[PDB]
């Protein structure tokens, strides 16, 4: 009854960062080695916990949030960061405990003519709270006149599409990101190591 981390990391399709996906992992035995002994990853940043010891530990739940961003924004998926992704799309708390794993997916998420299916939120009335997901598609009102649901003067589309082209520089290429959060409640622990 291994934990279904394969269906998270090896998922054929990933979500947009504004609509980031969450998979709850529970009642499972996990082998985190397969993750931290892999050579397929570009970023593997852990916070408040050692992955090398995750197989000796137990947890109530593990949340696996996955999405796609561009390379130069992977730095934003960390506690205490700012910018469009951290403010408007996916925000980590200061007391984050878990790991942030990313790898270049240019061969999968870019295509000739551009892949415009991956979007991120460009405007918002306020910064997101930790782990808040906003899938609003309302025209952003930047001025005094209501927008009446259409784009116009001082009223902008809230979401912006990534221009993923195979010729993009590496910092503008798509990167698939998986954020593992480890939850310990005053309850039985159901995600454990071998």
């Amino acid at each position, epitope marked *: 009854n291994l934990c279904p981390f394969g269906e998270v990391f090896n998922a054929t399709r990933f979500a947009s960062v504004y609509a980031w996906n969450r998979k709850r992992i529970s009642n499972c035995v996990a082998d985190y080695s397969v993750l*931290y*002994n892999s*050579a397929s*990853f*570009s*970023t*593997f*940043k*852990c*916070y*408040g*916990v*050692s*992955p*090398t*010891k995750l197989n000796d530990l137990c947890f109530t739940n593990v949340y696996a949030d996955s999405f796609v961003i561009r390379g130069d924004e*992977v*730095r934003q998926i960390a506690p205490g960061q700012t910018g469009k992704i951290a403010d408007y799309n996916y925000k980590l708390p200061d*007391d984050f*405990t878990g*790991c942030v794993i990313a790898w270049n997916s240019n061969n999968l998420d870019s295509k000739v003519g551009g892949n415009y299916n991956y979007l991120y939120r460009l405007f918002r009335k306020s910064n997101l709270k930790p782990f808040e997901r906003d899938i609003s598609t309302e025209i952003y009102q930047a001025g005094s006149t209501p927008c009446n649901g259409v784009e116009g003067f001082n009223c902008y589309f809230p979401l912006q599409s990534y221009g993923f082209q195979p010729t993009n520089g590496v910092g503008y290429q798509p990167y698939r990101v998986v954020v593992l959060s*480890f939850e*310990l409640l005053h309850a039985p622990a159901t995600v454990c190591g071998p």
Partner: antibody, heavy 119, light 114 residues
Framework: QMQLVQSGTEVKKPGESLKISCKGS????????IGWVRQMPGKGLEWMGI????????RYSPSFQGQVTISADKSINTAYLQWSSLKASDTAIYYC????????????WGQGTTVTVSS | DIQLTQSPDSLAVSLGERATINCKSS????????????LAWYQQKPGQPPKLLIY???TRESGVPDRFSGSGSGTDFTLTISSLQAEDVAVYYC?????????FGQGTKVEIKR
């Protein structure tokens, strides 16, 4: 499973630059943050700073910020500690230590680089 | 910055006897997320790099003899060497990794009493 190897002994003159290294080998190096610890002769350990080689995210302690530069070449799994102009007070042993993640203990240590700056 | 202080500075105890080292924290290093104290104990022998003995205040690193025990919480921690051996003559450091910048205790020297 992970090992850190540091460059050899250094004997320099005051005012000279210096760059010492610490190379990692083994499985799981992608998760490791490399910190630098100073130990002056007969004294204790002083945490100078830390770097994640994957994106060169660097954190310094306020007592060493601006005095040294910590960097990394991820293509060769190497971290670097450098001075632009050495002082006699820089004479010490410098350890590179490794921890798989921020807010984690230093479970892997290098053998140490002895640095002597003297007239 | 979190300040750590150790006590005593020097310790001499006979073969097979007990050795106690106290680490005081100027600030709590307990994360209520996973309910763990982010405190580690290292041992350094002459001419040797430091070696991690205990992490999370009370968890022994793999290959560390049971005679090394970590205890405590909040701002008060203790390393206890039940039955001191000749191999254990060394300087011991507590360190907090709750938040950067990481800080060390000043170190406690442990020698054989004769």
């Amino acid at each position: 499973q992970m090992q850190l190897v540091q460059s050899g002994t250094e004997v320099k003159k005051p005012g000279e630059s210096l760059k010492i290294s610490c190379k990692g080998s083994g499985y799981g190096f992608i998760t490791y943050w490399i910190g630098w610890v100073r130990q002056m002769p007969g004294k204790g350990l002083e945490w100078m700073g830390i770097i994640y080689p994957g994106d060169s995210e660097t954190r310094y302690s306020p007592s060493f910020q601006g005095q040294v530069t910590i960097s990394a070449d991820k293509s060769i799994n190497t971290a670097y500690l450098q001075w632009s102009s050495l002082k006699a007070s820089d004479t010490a042993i410098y350890y590179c230590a490794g921890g798989s993640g921020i807010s984690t203990p230093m479970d892997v240590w290098g053998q140490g680089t002895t640095v002597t700056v003297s007239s | 910055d979190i300040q750590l202080t150790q006590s005593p500075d020097s310790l001499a105890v006979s073969l097979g006897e007990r050795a106690t080292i106290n680490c005081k924290s100027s600030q709590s290093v307990l994360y209520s997320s996973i309910n763990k104290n982010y405190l580690a104990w290292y041992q350094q022998k002459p001419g040797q790099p430091p070696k991690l003995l205990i992490y999370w205040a009370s968890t022994r690193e793999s290959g560390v003899p049971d005679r090394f025990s970590g205890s405590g919480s909040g701002t008060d921690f203790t390393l206890t060497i039940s039955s001191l051996q000749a191999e254990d003559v060394a300087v011991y450091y507590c360190q907090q990794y709750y938040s950067t910048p990481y800080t060390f205790g000043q170190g406690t020297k442990v020698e054989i009493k004769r």
